[PDB]
Amino acid sequence: NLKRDLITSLPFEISLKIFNYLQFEDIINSLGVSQNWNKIIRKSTSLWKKLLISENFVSPKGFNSLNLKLSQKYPKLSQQDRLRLSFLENIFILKNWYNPKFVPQRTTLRGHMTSVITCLQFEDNYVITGADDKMIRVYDSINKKFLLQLSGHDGGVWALKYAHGGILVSGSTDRTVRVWDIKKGCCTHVFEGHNSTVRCLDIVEYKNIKYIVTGSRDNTLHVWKLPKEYPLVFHTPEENPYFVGVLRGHMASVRTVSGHGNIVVSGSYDNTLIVWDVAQMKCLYILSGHTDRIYSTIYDHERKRCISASMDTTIRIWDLENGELMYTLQGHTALVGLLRLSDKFLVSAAADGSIRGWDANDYSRKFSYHHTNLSAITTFYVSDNILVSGSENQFNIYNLRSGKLVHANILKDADQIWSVNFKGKTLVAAVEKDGQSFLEILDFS
Amino acid sequence: LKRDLITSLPFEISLKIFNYLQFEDIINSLGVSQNWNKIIRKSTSLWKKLLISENFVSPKGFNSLNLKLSQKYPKLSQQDRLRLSFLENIFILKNWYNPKFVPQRTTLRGHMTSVITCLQFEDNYVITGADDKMIRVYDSINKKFLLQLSGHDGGVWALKYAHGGILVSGSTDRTVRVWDIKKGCCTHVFEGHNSTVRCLDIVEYKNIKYIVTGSRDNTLHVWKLPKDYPLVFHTPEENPYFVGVLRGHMASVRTVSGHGNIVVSGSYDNTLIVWDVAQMKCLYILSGHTDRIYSTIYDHERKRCISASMDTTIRIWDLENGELMYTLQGHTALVGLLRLSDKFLVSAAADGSIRGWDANDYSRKFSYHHTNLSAITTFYVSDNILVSGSENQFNIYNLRSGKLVHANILKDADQIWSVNFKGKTLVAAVEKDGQSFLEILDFS
Amino acid sequence: SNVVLVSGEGERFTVDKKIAERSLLLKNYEIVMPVPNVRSSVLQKVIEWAEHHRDSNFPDKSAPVDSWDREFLKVDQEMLYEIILAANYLNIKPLLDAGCKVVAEMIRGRSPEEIRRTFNIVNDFTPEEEAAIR
Amino acid sequence: SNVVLVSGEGERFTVDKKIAERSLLLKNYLNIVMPVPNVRSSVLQKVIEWAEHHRDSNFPPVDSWDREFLKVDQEMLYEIILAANYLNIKPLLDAGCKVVAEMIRGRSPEEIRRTFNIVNDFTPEEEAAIRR
Numbered sequence A: 001n002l003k004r005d006l007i008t009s010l011p012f013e014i015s016l017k018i019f020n021y022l023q024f025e026d027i028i029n030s031l032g033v034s035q036n037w038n039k040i041i042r043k044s045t046s047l048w049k050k051l052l053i054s055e056n057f058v059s060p061k062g063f064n065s066l067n068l069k070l071s072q073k074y075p076k077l078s079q080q081d082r083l084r085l086s087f088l089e090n091i092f093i094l095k096n097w098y099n100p101k102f103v104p105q106r107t108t109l110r111g112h113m114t115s116v117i118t119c120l121q122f123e124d125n126y127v128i129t130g131a132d133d134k135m136i137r138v139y140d141s142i143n144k145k146f147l148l149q150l151s152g153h154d155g156g157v158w159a160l161k162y163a164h165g166g167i168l169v170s171g172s173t174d175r176t177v178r179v180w181d182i183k184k185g186c187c188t189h190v191f192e193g194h195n196s197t198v199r200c201l202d203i204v205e206y207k208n209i210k211y212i213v214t215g216s217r218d219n220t221l222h223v224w225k226l227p228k229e230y231p232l233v234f235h236t237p238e239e240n241p242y243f244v245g246v247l248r249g250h251m252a253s254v255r256t257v258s259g260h261g262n263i264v265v266s267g268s269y270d271n272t273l274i275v276w277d278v279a280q281m282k283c284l285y286i287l288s289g290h291t292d293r294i295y296s297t298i299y300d301h302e303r304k305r306c307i308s309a310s311m312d313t314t315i316r317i318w319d320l321e322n323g324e325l326m327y328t329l330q331g332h333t334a335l336v337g338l339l340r341l342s343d344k345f346l347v348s349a350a351a352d353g354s355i356r357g358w359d360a361n362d363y364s365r366k367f368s369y370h371h372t373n374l375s376a377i378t379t380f381y382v383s384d385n386i387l388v389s390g391s392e393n394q395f396n397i398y399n400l401r402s403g404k405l406v407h408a409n410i411l412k413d414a415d416q417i418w419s420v421n422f423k424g425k426t427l428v429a430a431v432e433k434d435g436q437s438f439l440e441i442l443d444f445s
Numbered sequence B: 001l002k003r004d005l006i007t008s009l010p011f012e013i014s015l016k017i018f019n020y021l022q023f024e025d026i027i028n029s030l031g032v033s034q035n036w037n038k039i040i041r042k043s044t045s046l047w048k049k050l051l052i053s054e055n056f057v058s059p060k061g062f063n064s065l066n067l068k069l070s071q072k073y074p075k076l077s078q079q080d081r082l083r084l085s086f087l088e089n090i091f092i093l094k095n096w097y098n099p100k101f102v103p104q105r106t107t108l109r110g111h112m113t114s115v116i117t118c119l120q121f122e123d124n125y126v127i128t129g130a131d132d133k134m135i136r137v138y139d140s141i142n143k144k145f146l147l148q149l150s151g152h153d154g155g156v157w158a159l160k161y162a163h164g165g166i167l168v169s170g171s172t173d174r175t176v177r178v179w180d181i182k183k184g185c186c187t188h189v190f191e192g193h194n195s196t197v198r199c200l201d202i203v204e205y206k207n208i209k210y211i212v213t214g215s216r217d218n219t220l221h222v223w224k225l226p227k228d229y230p231l232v233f234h235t236p237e238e239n240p241y242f243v244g245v246l247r248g249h250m251a252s253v254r255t256v257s258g259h260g261n262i263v264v265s266g267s268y269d270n271t272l273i274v275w276d277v278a279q280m281k282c283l284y285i286l287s288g289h290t291d292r293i294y295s296t297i298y299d300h301e302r303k304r305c306i307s308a309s310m311d312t313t314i315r316i317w318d319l320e321n322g323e324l325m326y327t328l329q330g331h332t333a334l335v336g337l338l339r340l341s342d343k344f345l346v347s348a349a350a351d352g353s354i355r356g357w358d359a360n361d362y363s364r365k366f367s368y369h370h371t372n373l374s375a376i377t378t379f380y381v382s383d384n385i386l387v388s389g390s391e392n393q394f395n396i397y398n399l400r401s402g403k404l405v406h407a408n409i410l411k412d413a414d415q416i417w418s419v420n421f422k423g424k425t426l427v428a429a430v431e432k433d434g435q436s437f438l439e440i441l442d443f444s
Numbered sequence C: 001s002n003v004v005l006v007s008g009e010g011e012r013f014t015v016d017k018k019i020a021e022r023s024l025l026l027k028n029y030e031i032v033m034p035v036p037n038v039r040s041s042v043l044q045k046v047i048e049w050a051e052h053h054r055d056s057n058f059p060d061k062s063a064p065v066d067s068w069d070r071e072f073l074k075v076d077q078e079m080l081y082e083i084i085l086a087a088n089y090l091n092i093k094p095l096l097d098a099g100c101k102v103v104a105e106m107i108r109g110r111s112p113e114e115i116r117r118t119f120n121i122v123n124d125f126t127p128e129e130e131a132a133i134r
Numbered sequence D: 001s002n003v004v005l006v007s008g009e010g011e012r013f014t015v016d017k018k019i020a021e022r023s024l025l026l027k028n029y030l031n032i033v034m035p036v037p038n039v040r041s042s043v044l045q046k047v048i049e050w051a052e053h054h055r056d057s058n059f060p061p062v063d064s065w066d067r068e069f070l071k072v073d074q075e076m077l078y079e080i081i082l083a084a085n086y087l088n089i090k091p092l093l094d095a096g097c098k099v100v101a102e103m104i105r106g107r108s109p110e111e112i113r114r115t116f117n118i119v120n121d122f123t124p125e126e127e128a129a130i131r132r
C-alpha cells in the first residue's frame, strides 16, 4: 500500500537526523527493527557520542580519553560498537545507582592505625588513603582487597596525588615530598627543600612532561619534575635534578593548589590566590579581595577561570584572561570543605548541613540538599548525575536529575565519614566505626 | 501601406498606449495576436493599475492581495493571477451595479429570538449571535447552517472571528469565551468582568495575538488568544492568558478599535482613551464631545482616530501628539455606526442619514436618506458599494454614480439587524414577523 | 538666438534655441545637433509641434489630446510611428504622450478583426487558441 | 520581485523572491527561473505552501501548523523530506524528521514494523543475540 520504510529509503544522513531526535529507549528498539536498521544505527559514531553526552556519561572534552580506554578494553570491536556497549553498560549501572531498591555489594577493609583519614585517591582500580599515622595504604578496587602499606614518612600525610602507572606522590608534616611505586611497593624518591609542612600538591603535564607542584606552610610552592625511568634521597634542591624552582609570593601558608598544563593556581592563608605560569616560573596574577583565609581552589581550564572559597564566607570566580574578578557568591552561612566542578555544576558544602550547586557556566542556583540532622558535612563527591554526601551518622546519595534522596540507608552503622569518591559502579568511603577507621567499597554492578 | 505599431514600438511605449484604454479594449487586444497577447500579459503593471483604479485593492493592500492569489493560484504567473482577479472582480461589480441583475437568495433559519445582536462574515463563515445565548455558524459557500455553539449563560453581544476558524465572544454572563468552530465547541472561558462585555477586538503585534475586551464596567481587559475541552478560568490572576486591566473611563466602554499595539476606546463618559497594550499604558485623553461616544476607528494607516458621538458631531484626532484636527458636521442626530474604507469615512445617524467623507481630508463625498427617515440600523461599505438597512428598508447604493441600484431585494424584511458583504456575497441578519433569519445574496 | 538640427536624410533645420529646448536631449549639457535615423519629414513635424507649443505648459484617465494635436497627428501610421519614435528619442514627453493617446484612440471600441485590419497584422492563432475565448 | 520554480513535471510556480529565498539553494542561485529536478508538482506546491506560511518566522523544540501540514501519507512525507533536503530548507527538513521520529517514539519493534511495512529479517540467532 502507501507504506514505505522511510529510514531505509532516505539518505543515510537524513536517517541519523531522525534517529537523533529519539530517546535512547527508542534507539534500542530501532536496533531490533531489522538488519538494515541495525546496520544503519550501528554505523554512526556520532549517534552514540550524542547519546553518551546527553546522559552525561561523558563530556566533549573527555571523549578521546574514553575512546582510547575502549579500544583497550575491546580491541576487536568498532568505534561505534564500543560506544554502544559503553552506553548500555553505563545505563545499567546508572539505573542501579538510581533505584532505591537496589542494594550494592558492600566490602569492608581495615583502615589506618589512627581513626582519622586525611586524604583519599581513587584511580585505575587503586584506592589510596593517607593519615596521621604516617602511612599510605593502597587497596585494589576490583578485587576489593588491601594491597599494601607504604611507610617512611616521619609525620602525618597531608596530601597525595596518584599519577598514571602505579606512581604516587605524597606530602607530609615531615616536610618531605615523596614519590612511590605501588607495583614495586616502596619509596623511590625523597625531595627535601620545604622548610615546613607540605600542605597540598598537584601534578600537571605540559609539552609531555609531568610536574609535581607542592604548596607548604612555609609560604612557598616548589616545582619538581615527576621522575620517569631503594629510596633516593635529595637533601639539597640545588643538587637535585628533579628540582625546577620555588614559587614565592604568598605571605602565609599555602593551603590549596590546582593546576592544568603550565598554569597553576594556589590559595593562601594570606587571603590571596596567585596564578602562576609554571614553564616560565612566574607569577601571572595576584587575586585580591577575599578578606580571610582561602581553603579551596579549582582552576577551571576549560573555561579559563579560577574558583576560590574563603573563610570570609564567599566564593569568587575569577577570569584568567585578565586576572579580573567575575562573580561573588554569598552568603548567610559559611562554606566548608573542598569544592568540586563537574561538567554541569560547581558544588560546595556549607556550615549548615547542606550541599549547594551552581551551574558551572553562569553560576545560577541549581540545587540544595540537606542532611535532616543539621549535621556538619564532612565530605561529598559529585558528578553531573549523582551527589554522595557524608556527615556524622549520615551517608546520603542523591539523584541530581530528579532531585531526590535515593539512599539514606547504605552506611548507617558508620559513625563518621571522612572521605568519599566514586566512578561508575564503584563508590568508596574512608570511614570511622566505634572509634576505628575502615575503607568501604560499594559496587553497583 | 500600414504598420503593427504595438509590435514595432519598444515594450515600454506600447504599454503606455495600453494604460490609456479601458479594460474592455485591453481584453479585445488580447485577441489580436501571439505578440499582442504576449505583450499584454508580460505586463504586471497594466493589471495592477487596473485593480487599483476600479478600487479592488489599494496601493497598501497590494502585496497582501498578491500573496493571497499566490496561495490560491500557485501555478499561474503574477500577471495572469492579476488578470484573473481583475476579470473576476469586474464581472462581480457589473452585477452589483446592474439594475436588471437580481442576485440569488437563500434565506436560513436564525436564532430562537427575533433580534440578532452581532455578525461576523469572514473565511466563508457567517457567524451570528443573539439574546437567545447562542452563536450560529453558517457556510457562505454552500449557503448552509453548519452548527450551533452553546455554552454562554446569557445574551451574546460581541463576536470577533480570528484566522484559523477561531472565534471570540462577549456576553451578559460577563464571560469571554473562545471557540473552535472546526471542532464545534468552546475551548477557553475567561472570567473577570463585573458586568456585560459590550465590545471587543483582536490585534496582533510582534507575531503574538491579543484580545481586548470592553465592558459596561468602565475598564477593558486584555487577554492573549490561545495558540476536557470546556477549559475554564474563574481566576484572572491565575489565568495564564490574562495580561491586565486598563482602567480610565468613568463609564461603560461602548466601542473599541485597534491594531498592532495601539487600541482606542470610546465611552458613555463622552471621552476616548488611546492605549498601548504592550506597556498596558494610557496614551491620550480625547476629550471634547458633550455626549456619549458610540463608535471609534483607529485609522492606523494615517495614525488617526475618528469618534462618533450622541453629541451629534464627528471628531478626527492626530494620534501622533493627540489633538483635534477636525470636527465634522453632517448629522443632526447621533452618529451610531462608523466605517472607514480606503476612500470614505462613512457614518450613519439615527435621523436615517448616511454620510460619506473623504478618508484623507474629510470633504463631503455623499449623503443618503432612507425615505422613511427611520434609524439606520446597520450598514456596510466599500469604495464601490453602500448597503444600508433600516426598518422596512434595504438598500444597495452604487457609490460611483450615487444611484440606488436596488431597493426591494429584501422587501419582505421588517428589520435589518446587521449587514456585511465581500466580493459576490451579501449577507444580512434580518427580522420577519417575529422570527429572525439569515439572508444571503449572491452576485456571481 | 537659433540652433541647427540635422535629420537623418541630411537636411538642416534652423530653429529657436528655447523652442528646441523642448527636447530634453537637446537641452542637456552656432551649435549644430544631429538627429540620427529620423526622416527629415519627421523632424520637421516635431519642430512644428514644438513651435506651436512654445507657450504651453503641461502637467507631470488623463488630459485628453489637444484639438490641434489631433489634426497634426491625423497622419499615416508610419509617420505616426516615427514621430512617437522621435519624441522618445528626443525625450519630448508631452509629444510621446499625445502620440500614444492617438494610437489608443485607434484601438478604442474596435473588435479583434477590426483592429487587425486597422494595422495589417496577421492572425496567427491556431484554431484552438482562437476558439479559447472568454 | 518574483522567481519561478520548475517542478520535475514541468510546472512553473511563481513565488515571491524574498519568500522563495527560504531555500538556500535558491538564495545561492547565484548569480529568474530555477529547475527543481525530481520533485513532483504536488510536493513542490506543498513546499511552497510551507515557505509562504512561514514567510515571517524566525528560525535559529516541536511544531504546530506544521503538524496538519505534515499529516500526509508516508510517500508524501518522504518526498517532502527529499525536496527540503535538496532545496536546503533546514527548518522544514528538521520538521519532517521530527514527524518521522513521532511515529517511532515509544513503539515496540513489532509496531515499528507494522507502521512502515518492514520485514523482520533476523535469523533466530541474530534475534536471540538481540534481546541479550
Ligand SMILES: O=C(O)c1ccc2ccccc2c1-c1c(C(=O)O)ccc2ccccc12
Residues within 6 Å of the ligand: A329, A330, A331, A332, A333, A334, A335, A350, A356, A357, A358, A365, A366, A367, A368
Ligand atoms: O543565598 C542563599 O541562601 C542560597 C539559597 C539557595 C541556594 C541554592 C543553590 C546554591 C546556593 C544557594 C544559596 C547560596 C548562595 C547563592 O544564592 O548563590 C551563595 C552562597 C551560599 C552559601 C551558603 C548557603 C547558600 C548559599
